[PDB]
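Title: Request for sanity check on Major strawberry allergen Fra a 1-2 prediction

Description:
We are preparing a figure and want to confirm that the structure record we downloaded matches what your pipeline produces today. Could someone re-run it with the sequence below and paste the raw structure tokens into this thread? We only need the token string, no images.
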Amino acid sequence: AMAGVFTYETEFTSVIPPPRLFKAFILDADNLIPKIAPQAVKCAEIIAGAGGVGTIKKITFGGSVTHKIDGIDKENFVYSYSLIEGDALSDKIEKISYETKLVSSSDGGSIIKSTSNYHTKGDVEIKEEHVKAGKEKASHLFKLVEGYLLANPNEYC
């Protein structure tokens, strides 16, 4: 049965510049996300690793997923991870690999460049509705982080 990759690319915009945005939303995600969205996470636990590349994290929602860290680039503001266990995975979708890149905008903020790679087996049936519902949920989480950082200008400086 046919192996393939379905790639979906999207961009979000922030008034926050890449260094502060990467420090708060990516590097302190385990602490910042439950502070801003308490109803979103029940408990996030490290299975293996020290917090860098190769770390295995279990995540429970207020639903259970297992992520593996693939890449962290503290200078170029690039973060990579993989969904290696969850309800989204099946015989059709064997894995989901993500990449987030923070680029500086003309305004002085960020362009958040997100890539989703669905690793597929056999016939490919991917619904626009499901992809778009996940985009809206990601967009909302990013806007809560943005709000919190604008309200707390000394934090993650």
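Thanks, this matches our download. The domain at 1-157 is CATH 3.30.530.20 (Alpha-D-Glucose-1,6-Bisphosphate; Chain A, domain 4).
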